[PDB]
Structure formats: structure tokens, C-alpha cells
Design a protein around this ligand. Sequence first.
Ligand SMILES: CC(C)S(=O)(=O)N(Cc1ccc(C(=O)NO)cc1)Cc1cccnc1
Ligand SMILES: [K+]
Ligand SMILES: [K+]
Ligand SMILES: [Zn+2]
Length: 354
Amino acid sequence: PITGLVYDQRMMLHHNMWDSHHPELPQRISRIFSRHEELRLLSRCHRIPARLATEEELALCHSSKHISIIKSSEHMKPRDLNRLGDEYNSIFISNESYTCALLAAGSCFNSAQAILTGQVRNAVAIVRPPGHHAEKDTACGFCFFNTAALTARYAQSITRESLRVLIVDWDVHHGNGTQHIFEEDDSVLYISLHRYEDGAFFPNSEDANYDKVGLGKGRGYNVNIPWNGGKMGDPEYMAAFHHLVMPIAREFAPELVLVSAGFDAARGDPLGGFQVTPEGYAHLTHQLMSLAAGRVLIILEGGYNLTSISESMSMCTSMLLGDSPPSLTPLKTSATVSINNVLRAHAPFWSSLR
Ligand SMILES: CC(C)S(=O)(=O)N(Cc1ccc(C(=O)NO)cc1)Cc1cccnc1
Ligand SMILES: [K+]
Ligand SMILES: [K+]
Ligand SMILES: [Zn+2]
């Protein structure tokens, strides 16, 4: 049983020319990589090479217009970059951004390919910029292309169209792009846990509420677990996994699991306001490893405390490598309210919840 790891320092080249201390820092990925070396986890993994996604691969999820405009930013002047970035919600762009986004996606494709051809059992992808806010037609929230959604379609392209892919998104933010890309799709089950605050928390849309269950043939295949009123942490995430994520996932029986693994719900994050611990993330990973015969790919999304994300992701990798889960406040009442609302919304579609 081999664990893959992909990391390429040149994904650090994407940078914010106007605000060099912007939290989506180049050093997010180098710090996570360094922590893996420091804990002697890196030598335990098989290194999977990074590569650039192709434009044809991007078209698995994105429109030609969106691909073309982001592609053009490689040769734009500073004023062009500033004006283009300001067309989107929370985007900065440098001449290196497009290539870095291609590298993030291609890294994840090579990891999925290694899992699906049996070269490795599981894998971790230390990549930036993130992806889960990117839509078919637009960039958003530090994300240019939807790396995880692309990886799910890439996986289908090298196996069969109907390959069952579970995406668990534990970034503190709702993956609006991933939900929308697969909203009418029953072959990809999207489960997101996120700070919601009745629609007041970024990305500020009631699309993230529990009553959005999917559309068309995707009804039931979109599971939003939204948190309101409380600094959620390990007890709340474990409860959501016990009552919702794991029962639904087991019934879906995925053949591949992708984790949109932001670490912005971590204790110490400057934006998320939550308190999931590294041991908490380790337990969530270990639970997911019971699915899909262990074929799990962990993809970095957000997370902005360099120390917290490095400790948290490296512990997930420890779990992928087969290490025993480390040992873990009273459950917050508000979290149980959210869990019960999701249970009511999804009981029609999942017998394991009845
Ligand atoms: C408006 C900006 C100054 S902002 O930086 O504060 N911000 C933009 C932002 C977008 C996406 C992510 C992410 O991690 N997605 O997965 C993080 C931040 C709004 C905000 C605020 C408070 C908590 N969360 C998001
Ligand atoms: K999420
Ligand atoms: K779906
Ligand atoms: Zn986030």
C-alpha cells in the first residue's frame, strides 16, 4: 500500500502584486511540504510528478471563454492584470497565475491516474491556487479553475463516464463552483460542510443551504451541511460524519474519493473562525479511508494559518500512510440543529438515513 504525494515549488509563483501579504500566500504550499519533510512523512510517500493540465482537460468543466481569458493573463501588463482581477469576486492575478492553476490541476490528474491504475492506493496534492469556488464560466475566491471538479471528470475520462466519485469538501467555505458543476449529476456526489451563518458568510449565497439537494438527475447527490452560530470544531465535524457524511457515502459506494481539503476551519485560521484540530482532520481522513477501498485523494483548497495548515495536512497524510489515529468540548446545540435539517432534506434520497 503506497501513498502518493505531489508538490511543485513553481506553484509558488502565483502572487499578489498589490498586496504581498495577502493570505493566499506562495508559502502555504512550501510550508506544508516542509512540515512533511520535518516529520519524515515525505520519504514514506511515492513522489508523483506534477504536470500542466491541457486546455482540452480544462474544457471538461470550463467554458472556452473563461479558459481563453485566464490564459491571456500570462502576457498581460500590470494594469491589465489589476482590471481583469477586479472583474471577479476576490481574485488577484499575476503573469504566473494561469500556469500555476494548470500545474495544480495537472498534479491532481497525475495523482488520480496513479490511484486508478493501481500504482498507489491513496495520495495527497499540495497545490495552489485553490479551486472549489471556480465556476464553469468564472473565477472566484482565489480560484481560477475547479481543480477537484476537473479531477473528477478526468478520472471518468480514463475509466468510464459513470465512475462514481465522492467529493467531500471540508474547507470552511462552501464550494459553490463544485456544487454548480455537478448540480445535475448523479455520478459525482458532492458533500460540503461549511460555515454558513444564514447566508452571511462567504461566498454569501443561499445556494449553500441544506435544502439545495441537487437538480434533475442529480437530486439527492448534493449534500450541504451548513453551520450557524457557533465556533465549530472536532465534536461537530465528527457528529456530521457519523450522522450524514459516512451513511450517505457508504450508500453511494464511491469508486474514488476526492477531498476538497481546505484547512481554513482549523484552530488558528485568520478567516474561518472555527477550531478543528489536526487530530480532528486525522480522524476525518481515517473515516474516509474506509470508503472506495481506500482510493482517496486529498487536494489542498484554502487554509491561511501557515502553522495550522502544515500540521493539519501533514497529519492527514500520516493517516493515508496507515498510522493509527491520534486521540481527540460538549457538542454545540446549533450543530445538532443543522445536522437534523440535513437529515430531513436527504431522507427522501438515502435509505441509510431513514
Ligand atoms: C473580501 C476579502 C478581503 S477576504 O479575504 O476576507 N474574503 C475572500 C475569501 C475568498 C475565499 C476564501 C477561501 O478560503 N475559500 O475556500 C477566503 C477568503 C472574504 C471572507 C471573509 C471572511 C471569511 N471568509 C472569507
Ligand atoms: K466546504
Ligand atoms: K452532484
Ligand atoms: Zn476556504
